[PDB]
Amino acid sequence: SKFGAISSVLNDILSRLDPPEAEVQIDRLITGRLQSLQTYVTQQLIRAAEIRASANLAATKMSECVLGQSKRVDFCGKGYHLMSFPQSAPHGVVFLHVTYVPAQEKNFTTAPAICHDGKAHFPREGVFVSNGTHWFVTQRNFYEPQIITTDNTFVSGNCDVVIGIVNNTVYDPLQLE
Amino acid sequence: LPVSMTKTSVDCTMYICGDSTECSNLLLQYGSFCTQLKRALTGIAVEQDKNTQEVFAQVKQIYKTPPIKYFGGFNFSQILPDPSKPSKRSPIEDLLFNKVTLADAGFIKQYGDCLGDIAARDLICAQKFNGLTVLPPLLTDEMIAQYTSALLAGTITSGWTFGAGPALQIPFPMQMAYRFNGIGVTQNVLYENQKLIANQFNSAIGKIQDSLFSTPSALGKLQDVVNHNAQALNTLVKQLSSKFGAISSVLNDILSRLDPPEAEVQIDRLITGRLQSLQTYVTQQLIRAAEIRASANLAATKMSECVLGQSKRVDFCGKGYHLMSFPQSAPHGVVFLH
Amino acid sequence: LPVSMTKTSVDCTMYICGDSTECSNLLLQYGSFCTQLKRALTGIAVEQ
Amino acid sequence: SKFGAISSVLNDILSRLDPPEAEVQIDRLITGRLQSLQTYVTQQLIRAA
Amino acid sequence: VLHLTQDLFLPFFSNVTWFHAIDNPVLPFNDGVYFASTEKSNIIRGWIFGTTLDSKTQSLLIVNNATNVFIKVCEFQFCNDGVYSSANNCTFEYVSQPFLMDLEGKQGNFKNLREFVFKNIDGYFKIYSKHTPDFPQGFSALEPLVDLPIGINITRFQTLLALNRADYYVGYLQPRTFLLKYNENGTITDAVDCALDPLSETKCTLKSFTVEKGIYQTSNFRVQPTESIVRFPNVTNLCPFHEVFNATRFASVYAWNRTRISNCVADYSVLYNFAPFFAFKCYGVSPTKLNDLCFTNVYADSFVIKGNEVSQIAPGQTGNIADYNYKLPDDFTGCVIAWNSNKLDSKHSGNYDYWYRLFRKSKLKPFERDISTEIYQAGNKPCKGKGPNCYFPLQSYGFRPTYGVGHQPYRVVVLSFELLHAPATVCGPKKSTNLVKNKCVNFNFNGLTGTGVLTKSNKKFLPFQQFGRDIVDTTDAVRDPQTLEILDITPCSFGGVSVITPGTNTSNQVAVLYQGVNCTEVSVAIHADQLTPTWRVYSTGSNVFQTRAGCLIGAEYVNNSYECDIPIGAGICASYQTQSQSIIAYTMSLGAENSVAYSNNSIAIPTNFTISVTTEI
Ligand SMILES: *[C@@H]1O[C@H](CO)[C@@H](O[C@@H]2O[C@H](CO)[C@@H](O)[C@H](O)[C@@H]2O)[C@H](O)[C@H]1NC(C)=O
Ligand SMILES: *[C@@H]1O[C@H](CO)[C@@H](O[C@@H]2O[C@H](CO)[C@@H](O)[C@H](O)[C@@H]2O)[C@H](O)[C@H]1NC(C)=O
Ligand SMILES: *[C@@H]1O[C@H](CO)[C@@H](O[C@@H]2O[C@H](CO)[C@@H](O)[C@H](O)[C@@H]2O)[C@H](O)[C@H]1NC(C)=O
Ligand SMILES: *[C@@H]1O[C@H](CO)[C@@H](O[C@@H]2O[C@H](CO)[C@@H](O)[C@H](O)[C@@H]2O)[C@H](O)[C@H]1NC(C)=O
Ligand SMILES: *[C@@H]1O[C@H](CO)[C@@H](O[C@@H]2O[C@H](CO)[C@@H](O)[C@H](O)[C@@H]2O)[C@H](O)[C@H]1NC(C)=O
Ligand SMILES: *[C@@H]1O[C@H](CO)[C@@H](O)[C@H](O)[C@H]1NC(C)=O
Ligand SMILES: *[C@@H]1O[C@H](CO)[C@@H](O)[C@H](O)[C@H]1NC(C)=O
Ligand SMILES: *[C@@H]1O[C@H](CO)[C@@H](O)[C@H](O)[C@H]1NC(C)=O
Ligand SMILES: *[C@@H]1O[C@H](CO)[C@@H](O)[C@H](O)[C@H]1NC(C)=O
Ligand SMILES: *[C@@H]1O[C@H](CO)[C@@H](O)[C@H](O)[C@H]1NC(C)=O
Ligand SMILES: *[C@@H]1O[C@H](CO)[C@@H](O)[C@H](O)[C@H]1NC(C)=O
Ligand SMILES: *[C@@H]1O[C@H](CO)[C@@H](O)[C@H](O)[C@H]1NC(C)=O
Ligand SMILES: *[C@@H]1O[C@H](CO)[C@@H](O)[C@H](O)[C@H]1NC(C)=O
Ligand SMILES: *[C@@H]1O[C@H](CO)[C@@H](O)[C@H](O)[C@H]1NC(C)=O
Ligand SMILES: *[C@@H]1O[C@H](CO)[C@@H](O)[C@H](O)[C@H]1NC(C)=O
């Protein structure tokens, strides 16, 4: 680009004008070519910062998901995280997140606490679920129907302050033996 | 949290040489100098659209609130959409949209009333006079509210299961009992003080509205964005009337009073000066765009973790032990209710 | 970990024109190429 | 640094040359000293982030 | 490579005027002429050029025969049919290989098309020819033939004929950006014009031949003004310049007579007539295009002065006169005039009337008069008189009819103009048009040249007001200099064109969006042919849509909802969807609508599970 001068070739512009008049010319060509380089450097700095941010994120993701199990949601993939594997790519890295996703679900029935005899019983972990006729206990993320027992429930309450309460009987493996 | 800023499409030749063929020809001598500027501005606009998408479009299926609103005694009417309002926005959304003033809406097609301004034409018309525009966002302020409502209705009827797999419904008292159990205190305490917890929830939700109403400016973070984006464009146009070393700031007068070579020397002084002032604005916009994208990445992470689940990391989702979080849309930003 | 840096408060008029009225007047012809600089420095200081 | 002018000090430039002739050289020095400052400000802005 | 050139070329799909031969009209010449001819063996000889085709302006001949050409730059007179009858000032002959190559495969069916294109950029006439054995649509390159420095004002283009016992295809080239596909061997295989279609302009910008699906922002449109209205001051008073330039007693430099020029129309042709220019150097204003200006006040100082002091007087000079008699401002917006006057300041026996200063206590500030008689002090004596150590300030400007060139009584008069933001009282002679409203028209209000849509305004313009602006200091309302009414000034029309297209591997249709402007404005102007874009997309009536993000032409509106494909703006997306295929505009669908079944005592808990492996880069 001429940048507003006689020519863009230095050996050409010199021989066709006297030195200082051609210098008035060479100084314009210089003050240009310098702006181009300055713009290049600034843009490279901005892209370098944007790349460094992603590199930091990739290092964190490697340490967290690859070297352990993470509880943060949607961090290491969609679903409940299990594990991940790294793969190298040109100028980058590729993660293979393994996640656990639930499946076919069925509406049953539910209740806050079961009142056997004036006392509210609560599941130690999981939910109270009813087939429709009988009451049971189970986990959260998988349905496995377990007979109601004194070891799967803990007692604290008075059967008069919880709303939605229902009636049924809770069994114990201690009175039988 | 800010999420995005205004999109701008500044134009080289119109800004620098108003419909002057000689000035355009002399600009052409600098090579591909402002094609870089146009590419940078296009990148900025695409980045803003991607930011808003990442923050808000976290759910593939939009849900709907149950027709009745009795979630175990908890009062929620301040956050779910109000059917009576034409815009279908919650009262908290309405206060937020009324407490922020935008200098340039963009989606106005103002062109056509500038002649009918009667009074002195405003800043928008002035910027339209010399080749600078503002593009409208792809996602309107109305469907952002729809996304927020879907996120809100997913939380209070299905827990956090809708954020991982299929949406499984569960009563709100039991969901709150599980959230209680997650922080290390048993569920029986909630099943004892259900009335107290509901009353405290309602009181806090009520008083947050008064706190936002009466405060002078609690939305300063969102307002600074529009303030800076306007006070940059103003100084870009106020610099169209600086001599830069020539004899006048009027290109027509320069080229209606002088002939070939002298017109040349003065037009060149003005081209160099107005090509700088233009190149300085793009770098500032690039740095500001990087800042806003970092702020949007933070907002996306906070939404995903606090809203679609319960977080254990301290002081991330608000001061204290975390239970819930509710999103609300704001102009060029998002607002969390921890 | 670094937390903050040094706050500078440069000024264009004294920097480019050592107490010279003529150089100040010539600088005045370039428009607002000084207010932006001062605003940037002030923002950096408040940010620190 | 002369920046293409005749002297790097703005004291003899206005003792060697009458205002208009000095202005020619004074404008050279001023554009140059207005850049250095712009570069400083831009690098500081980038380093702050 | 896909090297894109901005060069003089014939337009694509352009209109070639086909002729026939069984009388050889003259064709105008402007920015090159394309030529084509399909003939059996030969019916066309060559081409003549020049201006007026007479023995007064230089011409050219490319007349050909069996074995060579006859390139010559001559000034022939006429032939009216041995194709010329004058060779007086005729040199620069040239001989090379003949322009026509004819080959037949034992049959005349190989009718070769002989293309020719010429141009005279900075002289240097170039010729290009190629022979390919209504009009074929296959690409054929045009190998350059000869390139020699003609350097004549070529204005008229003609052609010859032959003798004997369906051709003449003439095109006209204009500067158009082209993009040419260079084959790996170095030939050219495909070319696209960048002023033909939206799709051609898109591929031209990205300099490629395949355009991926998406929306590309390419150029900007503007409504070109219909008319040009000029409003210059009601009066048409010629300035008293005549009185200034031909007085008989022009005051000398010491007391520079300053006259006032105001409330007049400034025509300087009379200035040209009343000036045997010998030194008309100008700095603040140029003298050629000077009558297109509206000056507020004009200052007309005249002083007779020597020949070298004519060079002395200039903005910011030095000397016995430039520093002690008449110093011009450094930022002088105005010019000086000097012509020799040896008939009015000269007489026999001498003439010592004039005076000049070489003795002043300090420098004379610009535009100041120091008429005074005070003897300069030398040393420390308070002496008041003439002689040694007591010098009289003024000296005689002695003039006689016999001097040298640098010592003649040169008559100098200066003009000072104030071309600033102020109500001008002195303008140039023009015809003031009428006023057209609600229509983009070039305006020339008292020298404030610009383009904009005018209208009536309900402003409260004070009696002393003339203009109005914003905090951005751009002129907004300019008081009609005649109808004393307030007139808003809009930027006519300025926007941006974006082209929505599916991949060219799929289809070639396009749709055009005019950014930030409503289509009622552009539908009027496209019908009146005033748009800067020449590419003209179809408008059936079913394909117009007012989006909040602009206004879209060429796509239909379908109310259905889909996942976004090509984001346009303001919640509108367009896509290529089967009807059998076309381009439609629809609204975004946020997601598959779903509703949950919340109840007081209902829970759904999963019975099974799946294992999914995702990826992240
Ligand atoms: C209640 O839950 C019971 C699970 O123990 C289901 O009863 C089963 O019934 C079969 C015979 O029909 C028994 O052989 C078996 O031992 C088991 O008890 C019962 O289907 C379920 N009821 C409903 C309505 O889901
Ligand atoms: C579960 O069964 C309890 C008896 O074992 C019920 O308590 C009774 O409540 C009635 C009033 O509703 C009293 O009149 C009676 O004396 C006894 O206290 C209890 O109501 C019942 N709950 C449900 C939900 O069925
Ligand atoms: C939930 O909380 C709402 C507060 O926004 C209650 O609305 C109030 O309704 C009263 C009149 O009933 C108004 O005077 C008041 O300004 C406010 O709008 C709403 O009643 C309440 N509902 C429930 C079921 O708790
Ligand atoms: C310069 O000389 C001019 C010509 O004498 C003066 O202009 C004219 O002077 C005549 C004198 O009869 C007036 O009648 C006429 O109206 C016009 O003014 C001019 O005044 C004079 N100026 C100076 C500053 O000397
Ligand atoms: C849980 O879901 C699995 C698939 O997601 C089921 O496995 C399938 O088993 C069938 C045969 O039973 C295969 O044909 C199929 O390819 C797949 O392996 C699995 O049976 C299912 N289990 C339950 C209890 O529903
Ligand atoms: C349970 O029944 C309700 C009643 O309509 C239904 O809406 C819901 O989808 C069901 N849940 C299942 C089948 O998992
Ligand atoms: C040019 O040709 C095309 C069609 O051949 C069309 O635009 C029009 O008929 C022609 N224009 C003329 C003859 O002015
Ligand atoms: C064509 O004209 C040239 C110029 O006189 C001559 O040298 C040549 O022999 C001619 N060719 C013919 C007559 O075939
Ligand atoms: C022939 O014409 C050229 C073209 O301008 C001219 O320069 C030259 O003087 C002419 N030769 C004469 C007049 O003898
Ligand atoms: C005619 O050609 C000469 C050759 O250089 C050129 O100087 C001149 O300007 C041309 N005529 C016009 C009117 O431009
Ligand atoms: C003064 O005016 C007369 C009018 O007849 C004109 O002929 C004459 O040329 C003028 N004087 C000069 C010096 O032009
Ligand atoms: C100027 O002339 C126009 C046209 O004759 C007339 O309508 C208008 O009133 C005049 N303006 C003034 C201020 O005299
Ligand atoms: C475009 O649409 C109509 C018709 O032209 C009118 O409102 C106005 O001209 C434009 N719209 C706006 C909001 O200015
Ligand atoms: C179909 O589109 C028209 C406008 O194009 C709209 O008025 C109408 O409501 C739409 N119908 C449906 C069912 O969306
Ligand atoms: C839940 O119980 C409350 C209070 O008894 C009642 O108002 C509401 O209608 C019930 N909802 C359903 C879905 O049964």
Residue numbers in the entry:
A (entry chain A): 968 to 1144
B (entry chain C): 727 to 1064
C (entry chain B): 727 to 774
D (entry chain B): 968 to 1016
E (entry chain A): 47 to 68, 80 to 138, 158 to 209, 215 to 246, 263 to 482, 484 to 677, 689 to 726
Paper text:
To further structurally verify this, we determined the cryo-EM structure of the BA.2.86 S-trimer in complex with hACE2. Like most complex structures, one or two copies of hACE2 are bound to the RBDs in the up configuration. Consistent with binding results, both the N354 glycan and T356 are located far away from the interface. Surface plasmon resonance (SPR) results demonstrated that RBDs with or without the N354 glycosylation showed comparable binding affinities to hACE2, indicating that the N354 glycosylation does not impact hACE2 binding. Moreover, the binding affinities of the BA.2.86 S-trimers with or without the N354 glycosylation for hACE2 yielded similar results, despite N354 glycosylation promoting the S-trimer ‘RBD-down’ state. However, we noted that variants with the N354 glycosylation exhibited very high affinities to hACE2, reflecting that tight binding might be required to further recover the compromised infectivity.
